[PDB]
Design an enzyme around this catalytic site. Sequence first.
Site, PDB file in Angstrom:
ATOM      1  N   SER A 103       0.794  -1.226   0.000  1.00  0.00           N
ATOM      2  CA  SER A 103       0.000   0.000   0.000  1.00  0.00           C
ATOM      3  C   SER A 103       0.832   1.285   0.000  1.00  0.00           C
ATOM      4  CB  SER A 103      -0.955   0.026   1.203  1.00  0.00           C
ATOM      5  OG  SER A 103      -1.954  -0.965   1.043  1.00  0.00           O
TER       6      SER A 103
ATOM      7  N   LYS B  37       0.160   3.707  -2.850  1.00  0.00           N
ATOM      8  CA  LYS B  37      -1.007   4.588  -2.975  1.00  0.00           C
ATOM      9  C   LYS B  37      -0.602   6.058  -3.025  1.00  0.00           C
ATOM     10  CE  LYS B  37      -4.059   1.060  -1.004  1.00  0.00           C
ATOM     11  NZ  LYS B  37      -4.453   0.166   0.119  1.00  0.00           N
TER      12      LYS B  37
ATOM     13  N   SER C 108      -6.085   3.596   3.727  1.00  0.00           N
ATOM     14  CA  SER C 108      -5.500   2.540   2.904  1.00  0.00           C
ATOM     15  C   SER C 108      -6.587   1.720   2.219  1.00  0.00           C
ATOM     16  CB  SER C 108      -4.577   1.647   3.734  1.00  0.00           C
ATOM     17  OG  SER C 108      -3.565   1.105   2.909  1.00  0.00           O
TER      18      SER C 108
ATOM     19  N   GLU D   2      -5.302  -3.568  -7.156  1.00  0.00           N
ATOM     20  CA  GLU D   2      -5.635  -4.235  -5.897  1.00  0.00           C
ATOM     21  C   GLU D   2      -6.636  -5.364  -6.155  1.00  0.00           C
ATOM     22  OE1 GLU D   2      -4.220  -3.504  -3.136  1.00  0.00           O
ATOM     23  OE2 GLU D   2      -3.508  -1.419  -3.174  1.00  0.00           O
TER      24      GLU D   2
ATOM     25  N   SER E 124       1.440  -3.223   3.763  1.00  0.00           N
ATOM     26  CA  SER E 124       1.699  -4.589   4.208  1.00  0.00           C
ATOM     27  C   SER E 124       1.125  -5.571   3.201  1.00  0.00           C
ATOM     28  CB  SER E 124       1.147  -4.851   5.607  1.00  0.00           C
ATOM     29  OG  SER E 124      -0.199  -4.469   5.698  1.00  0.00           O
TER      30      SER E 124
HETATM   31  B1  LIG Z   1      -2.227  -1.979   2.032  1.00  0.00           B
HETATM   32  O1  LIG Z   1      -0.868  -2.306   2.421  1.00  0.00           O
HETATM   33  O2  LIG Z   1      -2.990  -1.233   3.090  1.00  0.00           O
HETATM   34  C1  LIG Z   1      -4.167  -1.923   3.494  1.00  0.00           C
HETATM   35  C2  LIG Z   1      -4.288  -2.066   5.006  1.00  0.00           C
HETATM   36  N1  LIG Z   1      -3.208  -2.866   5.584  1.00  0.00           N
HETATM   37  S1  LIG Z   1      -3.453  -3.492   7.046  1.00  0.00           S
HETATM   38  O3  LIG Z   1      -2.249  -4.185   7.390  1.00  0.00           O
HETATM   39  O4  LIG Z   1      -4.692  -4.212   6.977  1.00  0.00           O
HETATM   40  C3  LIG Z   1      -3.670  -2.163   8.179  1.00  0.00           C
HETATM   41  C4  LIG Z   1      -2.570  -1.634   8.834  1.00  0.00           C
HETATM   42  C5  LIG Z   1      -2.747  -0.655   9.794  1.00  0.00           C
HETATM   43  C6  LIG Z   1      -4.022  -0.219  10.086  1.00  0.00           C
HETATM   44 CL1  LIG Z   1      -4.249   0.941  11.372  1.00  0.00          CL
HETATM   45  C7  LIG Z   1      -5.123  -0.737   9.438  1.00  0.00           C
HETATM   46  C8  LIG Z   1      -4.952  -1.716   8.476  1.00  0.00           C
HETATM   47  C9  LIG Z   1      -4.135  -3.198   2.696  1.00  0.00           C
HETATM   48  C10 LIG Z   1      -5.034  -4.255   2.817  1.00  0.00           C
HETATM   49  C11 LIG Z   1      -4.848  -5.394   2.058  1.00  0.00           C
HETATM   50  C12 LIG Z   1      -3.780  -5.482   1.187  1.00  0.00           C
HETATM   51  C13 LIG Z   1      -2.888  -4.428   1.073  1.00  0.00           C
HETATM   52  C14 LIG Z   1      -3.050  -3.262   1.833  1.00  0.00           C
HETATM   53 NA    NA Z   2      -0.573  -0.993   5.840  1.00  0.00          NA
END
Ligand SMILES: *[B@@-]1(O)O[C@H](CNS(=O)(=O)c2ccc(Cl)cc2)c2ccccc21
Ligand code: NA
EC number: 3.5.2.6
Length: 262
Positions: free
Chosen positions: A44, A47, A104, A140, A211
């Site tokens: 992410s 983005k 995100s 995505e 992530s």
């Molecule tokens: B992309 O990396 O961002 C979203 C959300 N990632 S998370 O790890 O679910 C997350 C981290 C911190 C908070 Cl506070 C909330 C959520 C995402 C989701 C799926 C795939 C890629 C990404």
């Molecule tokens: Na994230």
Amino acid sequence: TADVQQKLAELERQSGGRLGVALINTADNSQILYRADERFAMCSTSKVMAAAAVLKKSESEPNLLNQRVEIKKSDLVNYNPIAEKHVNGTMSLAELSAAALQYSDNVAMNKLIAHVGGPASVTAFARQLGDETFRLDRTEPTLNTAIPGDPRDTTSPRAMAQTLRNLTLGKALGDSQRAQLVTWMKGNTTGAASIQAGLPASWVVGDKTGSGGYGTTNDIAVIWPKDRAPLILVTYFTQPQPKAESRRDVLASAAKIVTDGL
Ligand SMILES: *[B@@-]1(O)O[C@H](CNS(=O)(=O)c2ccc(Cl)cc2)c2ccccc21
Ligand code: NA
Ligand SMILES: [Cl-]
Ligand code: NA
Ligand code: NA
């Protein structure tokens, strides 16, 4: 400092994974680099580049950010905290940009991507800025597979730090658009456990986390330390096991190591 280098190597060793760090200190134009030319899956953190592409397009299209985008059940993917609330209505491109950057939201990312012409157009925008490393290959949710050895949807820490500097502190974007990007990132809700957790509480941060597969855990940030010139910091981390859990503490630790003494 060779000591900072040794400390990052020790962190990487103990973490069990592969760590990439690029710090740019605009007080003296110095850098701290650790595997900064290796590729990591951006997840992410990509983005930021998509929102920036829309913002750039807006410089020549003043209505653009107010343009409405339909949200359909068929648009839902695997992480839709904002978009799932607007199914069967529209969101503006400003709203989608903010949702992508601050929550995100993956539907929001796909709409930004679609609007500017797809992943190769986001990549062409990077190239236009002088970033010849960034590549956005997929939409995505598949852009997050983060398979070791796979160059898709990757960049290096050095390139992303230099590009983030240009976007948030340089002149890649018009003044209105740069301010908007920075305001959005300063309002991110997803970063408190990452770079921010390794910095003093008084410091102001605008960041975008990422992530994905192989326990990939990422954060990229513009940082205003108390009474100091701003920093740019990219911390990228990924692991050997497909189902490894996230390690945001590794990014907080890298942030702490590279800012110690400032
Ligand atoms: B992309 O990396 O961002 C979203 C959300 N990632 S998370 O790890 O679910 C997350 C981290 C911190 C908070 Cl506070 C909330 C959520 C995402 C989701 C799926 C795939 C890629 C990404
Ligand atoms: Na994230
Ligand atoms: Cl503190
Ligand atoms: Na990059
Ligand atoms: Na953070």
